Design a protein around this ligand. Sequence first.
Ligand SMILES: *[C@@H]1O[C@H](CO)[C@@H](O[C@@H]2O[C@H](CO)[C@@H](O)[C@H](O)[C@@H]2O)[C@H](O)[C@H]1NC(C)=O
Ligand SMILES: *[C@@H]1O[C@H](CO)[C@@H](O[C@@H]2O[C@H](CO)[C@@H](O)[C@H](O)[C@@H]2O)[C@H](O)[C@H]1NC(C)=O
Ligand SMILES: *[C@@H]1O[C@H](CO)[C@@H](O[C@@H]2O[C@H](CO)[C@@H](O)[C@H](O)[C@@H]2O)[C@H](O)[C@H]1NC(C)=O
Ligand SMILES: *[C@@H]1O[C@H](CO)[C@@H](O[C@@H]2O[C@H](CO)[C@@H](O)[C@H](O)[C@@H]2O)[C@H](O)[C@H]1NC(C)=O
Ligand SMILES: *[C@@H]1O[C@H](CO)[C@@H](O[C@@H]2O[C@H](CO)[C@@H](O)[C@H](O)[C@@H]2O)[C@H](O)[C@H]1NC(C)=O
Ligand SMILES: *[C@@H]1O[C@H](CO)[C@@H](O[C@@H]2O[C@H](CO)[C@@H](O)[C@H](O)[C@@H]2O)[C@H](O)[C@H]1NC(C)=O
Ligand SMILES: *[C@@H]1O[C@H](CO)[C@@H](O)[C@H](O)[C@H]1NC(C)=O
Ligand SMILES: *[C@@H]1O[C@H](CO)[C@@H](O)[C@H](O)[C@H]1NC(C)=O
Ligand SMILES: *[C@@H]1O[C@H](CO)[C@@H](O)[C@H](O)[C@H]1NC(C)=O
Ligand SMILES: *[C@@H]1O[C@H](CO)[C@@H](O)[C@H](O)[C@H]1NC(C)=O
Ligand SMILES: *[C@@H]1O[C@H](CO)[C@@H](O)[C@H](O)[C@H]1NC(C)=O
Ligand SMILES: *[C@@H]1O[C@H](CO)[C@@H](O)[C@H](O)[C@H]1NC(C)=O
Ligand SMILES: *[C@@H]1O[C@H](CO)[C@@H](O)[C@H](O)[C@H]1NC(C)=O
Ligand SMILES: *[C@@H]1O[C@H](CO)[C@@H](O)[C@H](O)[C@H]1NC(C)=O
Ligand SMILES: *[C@@H]1O[C@H](CO)[C@@H](O)[C@H](O)[C@H]1NC(C)=O
Ligand SMILES: *[C@@H]1O[C@H](CO)[C@@H](O)[C@H](O)[C@H]1NC(C)=O
Ligand SMILES: *[C@@H]1O[C@H](CO)[C@@H](O)[C@H](O)[C@H]1NC(C)=O
Ligand SMILES: *[C@@H]1O[C@H](CO)[C@@H](O)[C@H](O)[C@H]1NC(C)=O
Lengths: 177, 338, 48, 622, 48, 39
Amino acid sequence: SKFGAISSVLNDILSRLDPPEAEVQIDRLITGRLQSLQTYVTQQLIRAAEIRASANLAATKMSECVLGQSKRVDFCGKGYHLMSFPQSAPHGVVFLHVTYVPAQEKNFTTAPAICHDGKAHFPREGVFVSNGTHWFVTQRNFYEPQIITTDNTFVSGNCDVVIGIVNNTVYDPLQLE
Amino acid sequence: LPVSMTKTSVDCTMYICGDSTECSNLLLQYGSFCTQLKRALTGIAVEQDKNTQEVFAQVKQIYKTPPIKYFGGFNFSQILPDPSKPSKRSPIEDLLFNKVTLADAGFIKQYGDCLGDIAARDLICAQKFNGLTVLPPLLTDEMIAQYTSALLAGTITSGWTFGAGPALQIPFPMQMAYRFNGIGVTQNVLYENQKLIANQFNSAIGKIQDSLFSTPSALGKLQDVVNHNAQALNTLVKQLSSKFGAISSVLNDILSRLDPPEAEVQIDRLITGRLQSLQTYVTQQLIRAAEIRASANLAATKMSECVLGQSKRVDFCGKGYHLMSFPQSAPHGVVFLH
Amino acid sequence: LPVSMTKTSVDCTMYICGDSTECSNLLLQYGSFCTQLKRALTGIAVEQ
Amino acid sequence: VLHLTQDLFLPFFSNVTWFHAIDNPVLPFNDGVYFASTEKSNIIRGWIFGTTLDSKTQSLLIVNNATNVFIKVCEFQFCNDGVYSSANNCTFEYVSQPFLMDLEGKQGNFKNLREFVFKNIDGYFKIYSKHTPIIGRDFPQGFSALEPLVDLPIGINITRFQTLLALNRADYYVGYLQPRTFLLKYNENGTITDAVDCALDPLSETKCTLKSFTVEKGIYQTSNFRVQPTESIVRFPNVTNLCPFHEVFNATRFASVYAWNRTRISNCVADYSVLYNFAPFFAFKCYGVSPTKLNDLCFTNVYADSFVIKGNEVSQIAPGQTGNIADYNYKLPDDFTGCVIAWNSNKLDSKHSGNYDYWYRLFRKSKLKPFERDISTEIYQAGNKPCKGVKGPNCYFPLQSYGFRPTYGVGHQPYRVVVLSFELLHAPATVCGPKKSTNLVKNKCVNFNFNGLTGTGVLTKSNKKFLPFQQFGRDIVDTTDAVRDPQTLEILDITPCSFGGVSVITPGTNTSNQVAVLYQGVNCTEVSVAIHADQLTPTWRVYSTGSNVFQTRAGCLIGAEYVNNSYECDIPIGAGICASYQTQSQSIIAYTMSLGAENSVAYSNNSIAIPTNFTISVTTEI
Amino acid sequence: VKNKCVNFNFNGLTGTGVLTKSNKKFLPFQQFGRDIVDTTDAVRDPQT
Amino acid sequence: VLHLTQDLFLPFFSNVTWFHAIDNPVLPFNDGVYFASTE
Ligand SMILES: *[C@@H]1O[C@H](CO)[C@@H](O[C@@H]2O[C@H](CO)[C@@H](O)[C@H](O)[C@@H]2O)[C@H](O)[C@H]1NC(C)=O
Ligand SMILES: *[C@@H]1O[C@H](CO)[C@@H](O[C@@H]2O[C@H](CO)[C@@H](O)[C@H](O)[C@@H]2O)[C@H](O)[C@H]1NC(C)=O
Ligand SMILES: *[C@@H]1O[C@H](CO)[C@@H](O[C@@H]2O[C@H](CO)[C@@H](O)[C@H](O)[C@@H]2O)[C@H](O)[C@H]1NC(C)=O
Ligand SMILES: *[C@@H]1O[C@H](CO)[C@@H](O[C@@H]2O[C@H](CO)[C@@H](O)[C@H](O)[C@@H]2O)[C@H](O)[C@H]1NC(C)=O
Ligand SMILES: *[C@@H]1O[C@H](CO)[C@@H](O[C@@H]2O[C@H](CO)[C@@H](O)[C@H](O)[C@@H]2O)[C@H](O)[C@H]1NC(C)=O
Ligand SMILES: *[C@@H]1O[C@H](CO)[C@@H](O[C@@H]2O[C@H](CO)[C@@H](O)[C@H](O)[C@@H]2O)[C@H](O)[C@H]1NC(C)=O
Ligand SMILES: *[C@@H]1O[C@H](CO)[C@@H](O)[C@H](O)[C@H]1NC(C)=O
Ligand SMILES: *[C@@H]1O[C@H](CO)[C@@H](O)[C@H](O)[C@H]1NC(C)=O
Ligand SMILES: *[C@@H]1O[C@H](CO)[C@@H](O)[C@H](O)[C@H]1NC(C)=O
Ligand SMILES: *[C@@H]1O[C@H](CO)[C@@H](O)[C@H](O)[C@H]1NC(C)=O
Ligand SMILES: *[C@@H]1O[C@H](CO)[C@@H](O)[C@H](O)[C@H]1NC(C)=O
Ligand SMILES: *[C@@H]1O[C@H](CO)[C@@H](O)[C@H](O)[C@H]1NC(C)=O
Ligand SMILES: *[C@@H]1O[C@H](CO)[C@@H](O)[C@H](O)[C@H]1NC(C)=O
Ligand SMILES: *[C@@H]1O[C@H](CO)[C@@H](O)[C@H](O)[C@H]1NC(C)=O
Ligand SMILES: *[C@@H]1O[C@H](CO)[C@@H](O)[C@H](O)[C@H]1NC(C)=O
Ligand SMILES: *[C@@H]1O[C@H](CO)[C@@H](O)[C@H](O)[C@H]1NC(C)=O
Ligand SMILES: *[C@@H]1O[C@H](CO)[C@@H](O)[C@H](O)[C@H]1NC(C)=O
Ligand SMILES: *[C@@H]1O[C@H](CO)[C@@H](O)[C@H](O)[C@H]1NC(C)=O
């Protein structure tokens, strides 16, 4: 680009005029090319900052998903994270998130607590679920019904403060033995 | 949290050489100095659209709240959409829109009333006079509220399951019991103090609206972003009235006053001034867009963690042991209710 | 981890035109080129 | 390479006029001429160029022969059919290899079609030719590059053009070139395979601005659209009184430079043709304004300074000069907005026996600041004496004599100099040029010339509260908003012409060539009335059938019909509208983007959904 | 002299570099060469 | 608008000299003069 100078070639402009006059054209070309180079450098700096941020994110994702299990939702892929595998790519990294995603679900029934005899029972770790006629306990993320038993549930309450409580019986392995 | 900023599409040719063929020919001697500027601004606009998409479009299926609203005693009328209002926005979402004043809407098609401005034409007509236009966002402020409503109605009827796989319904008292169990307190506490915790929740939700009402500016970050963009644009416009060492600051004046062979020097001075001003504007906009992108990434992470589940990281989702979060849309930003 | 750096408040007039009225008048012809710089430096200091 | 050039080219899909021969119209020559013909062996000989084609302006001839050509630049008279009858003041003959090469494969079916392009950019007559075997049964659509043959500098004026014939006992294809931007694709061997215009179709413009020949699916911002003004209005003030310029230049006693006469010019119509009249000019060096472009400006005040000085002192008088007059008698300011005048006056400032009525100062205590008068007779001090009284040694009179006689040299002849001062600043102008006052038209993009304020826009009535002394309007950003009409004393707002921006929405060219056009941020009833009046800067004319118009919130889309269905966003347009290429049998449709599948959950007091199965999904992240 | 860093002055086109034989397909009217970014790449020998 | 100007103005809360008539002293003129009178 001429940048307002007579010619755009330093070699041509140098042999075409004497230095006292060619100094003006050389100054114009210098003040153009220096500004172009500064624009390039500033753009490279901003892009390098963005790439550094992305690389920090990639490193965090590696240290969390790959080197362990991450509990943060939608961080290591969509779903319930299990593990990850890295793959190298040109000027980047590729992750293979392995996620656990639920499937076919069924309406059953639920109750916050179950009252055997004046005491409210709650699941230790799980949901109180009902086929429709017999109450059971099971996990939250997979349907594995179990017979209600004093080891699946902990007792604390008075059967009068819980809202939505449901009547049934809870079994204990100790009276039988 | 800011999520995006105003999208500008500066015209190098019109801004630097208003409808002057001689000035255009002189500007062509600088090479592609303004093609870079147009590309950078286009990238900034696309990045803003991507930021909004990342922050809000987190769920693929738009859920709807149940026709009745009895969430075990919890009151959500303040955050749920109001059917009576034409905009279909929450009462808490209305205050955010009424407390933020945008200098340039952009989606106005204001041409046609600059002639009819009657009084002295305002900032927007002044910017239109020198080729300084602003593009409208891809996602309107109405459908963003729809995304927010879907996301908030997914976290009160299905817990955190709709953020992982299929949405599985579960009563809100049981969801609250599970969130309680996640922080180390057993569920019997909630099942015994359900009424008291419902009263506390209602009181907090009620008094947050008045706290946003009576404060001068609690949304200072969004207003800060808007003011910064408007002031950068105003400073860009104000550089058109500087001579930059030329005979006059008006291209139409120096063109009609001097012959081209002598006017070329003044035109070159004006070129080297306005190009530098435009490059400074573009660089500052790039920096501000990078900062906004970082903030939008933080907002997207906060959404995905606090809203779509329970977060164990202390002081991330508010002060104290985190339970849940409700999103609210604000002009060029998002509002969280931890 | 770094938390902050030095806070600077560059002065346009004294840096470019040391106590020279003619240079100040010449600089005034550039418009508000450097008021942007002063605002940027103040914003950096406040941010830090 | 995909090099892009801007030069004189024949527009794609342009008007080409086909003739027949069995008299020889003279086709105008302007910006070059494209010539194409198809003949069996030979029916066309040569061409004639020049203006008026007579013996008064240099002409040109390119007549071919059996083995050579006869290019020359001459002063032909006529032939009216041996093709000339005059070669008086004629040079620059030239003979070389013939431009016509014809081959046949033992049959006349190979009717080679010959294409020629001539142009006269900065003289340097250029001729390009290319002979293709594509028979000419129909003007072929395949690409055939044109290679130069000769390049010779006629350096003459050409406006008219003719064509010779031959003898015997379907041709003449003529096209005209225009300045267009072309994108040319070069083969690996250096030939030209395909080229695309950049001012023909919206897809062509996107293909030009994203230089390539494959345009991927998406929306591309190419250029901006501007409503070109229709009528130019000039409204000069309500005065028709001519200046006393004649009195200024017809004085009899232009004073000396030491005491320069100073007059003022106001309440004028200033035409400088009368100034040119009474002046055998010698020096019209004008600095602030261009003398040619001087009758189209308005000055708030004009000052006419007059004095008589010597030949070298004319070159002395200029912004930032030096000398006895430029320092002690008349110093023009460095930022002088004005210009001087000088012509010989050897008949009024000269007489027999001599004349010394004039004076000048060489002895001043210091320099003279611009536009300062130092008329005073004080003896210049030398050494340290308080010298008073008579003049002599060490005691010098300040002003000496410009003794003028009718017999001097040119450098010493009594030149007459009158310098003019103008103030071209934002002010109520009182002195204006002789430009007429046209009518006023509102609500239409017009070039206005209100009292020297040149610009463009739409003007209309306003309800401002202009105070009596007010003349202009402005805004916090210092741009002219309203101008009071000098001949009507009313208030008119100024508007941008139509400034916007055109974005072209297209699928991939490997899929289809259909495109849609978006005019950003404009109520596009404005463009519809503008596009009918043919005052839009974009020349790429997209169709408007009524079914393809949709006023979006971001402008309006032309070329795509709106469907009320909802789909996933394919090409983001803006304000919740996305366009995509869908089957009908194919077209471009705009629709409101769907956020997702409308789903309703079944929340209840005691209903819970528990998954009885699960799946393992592996995703990827870049 | 080929394959050696020399200063060349081909028909007034001043510069420096290493020149050698090539297999370009220069058309008869071609004189210079260039690349995608407009730098002189090949030249035709005026006496060869 | 809040336009800002730099020009010759009478300073706020400045020294202004009040005269009386019932001789007519000459006042220096420099950079302009502000004149106010009631009658
Ligand atoms: C309640 O849940 C029971 C699971 O134990 C189901 O009862 C089953 O009934 C069969 C006979 O019908 C028994 O043989 C079996 O051992 C089991 O008890 C029952 O289907 C389910 N009720 C409903 C309505 O699904
Ligand atoms: C669960 O079963 C309890 C008895 O084992 C019920 O208590 C009874 O309540 C009735 C009134 O509802 C009394 O009249 C009676 O004396 C006894 O206290 C209890 O209501 C029941 N709850 C549910 C939800 O079925
Ligand atoms: C949930 O909280 C709402 C507060 O926004 C209650 O609405 C109130 O309705 C009364 C009139 O009944 C208004 O005077 C008041 O300003 C407010 O709008 C709403 O009743 C409440 N609902 C439940 C079930 O708690
Ligand atoms: C560029 O020019 C080359 C030499 O002239 C071409 O190579 C030739 O290819 C032909 C077959 O087309 C062979 O018969 C011959 O021996 C030689 O290899 C080459 O094709 C050409 N490239 C183009 C025109 O794109
Ligand atoms: C400069 O000379 C002009 C023409 O000779 C003068 O203009 C005229 O002057 C006569 C008196 O000589 C007036 O009667 C007439 O109206 C017109 O103004 C001009 O005055 C003179 N100026 C000076 C400062 O000498
Ligand atoms: C849970 O879902 C699995 C797939 O998502 C089921 O596995 C299937 O098994 C059938 C054979 O019964 C295969 O044909 C099929 O390709 C797939 O592997 C699995 O049966 C299912 N389990 C339950 C209890 O529904
Ligand atoms: C639960 O019942 C509701 C009531 O109709 C139904 O809409 C929903 O699909 C059911 N959920 C299932 C079958 O998983
Ligand atoms: C060529 O001329 C015909 C006849 O006037 C006209 O109909 C046609 O539009 C012209 N072509 C173009 C591209 O305008
Ligand atoms: C044709 O014209 C050329 C032009 O110089 C001339 O030399 C030649 O003698 C003419 N006749 C033939 C048969 O070529
Ligand atoms: C050639 O031009 C000159 C120009 O004055 C003229 O005098 C002369 O007669 C011309 N020769 C002719 C007409 O043969
Ligand atoms: C060429 O002739 C035309 C026709 O009169 C005229 O308008 C034009 O000014 C001429 N050009 C020159 C350079 O004489
Ligand atoms: C001055 O005016 C008179 C009017 O009769 C005219 O004859 C004369 O030529 C004029 N002189 C000049 C120098 O304009
Ligand atoms: C302009 O001048 C004409 C004729 O002198 C007069 O009729 C008209 O009223 C004038 N206009 C104004 C605004 O003074
Ligand atoms: C812009 O929109 C339409 C289309 O032109 C029309 O009502 C008018 O021109 C404008 N209306 C408003 C409210 O700006
Ligand atoms: C179909 O589209 C038209 C506009 O083209 C709209 O007026 C109408 O309401 C739409 N119909 C439905 C059912 O949405
Ligand atoms: C839940 O119970 C409340 C009162 O007990 C009742 O108003 C509401 O309709 C019930 N909702 C469902 C879905 O059963
Ligand atoms: C250059 O000139 C010489 C002598 O005239 C000749 O031998 C040689 O072939 C010429 N070279 C070319 C490339 O024409
Ligand atoms: C005005 O003059 C009085 C009397 O000299 C003086 O006391 C006062 O300070 C002056 N005002 C100002 C602003 O200096």
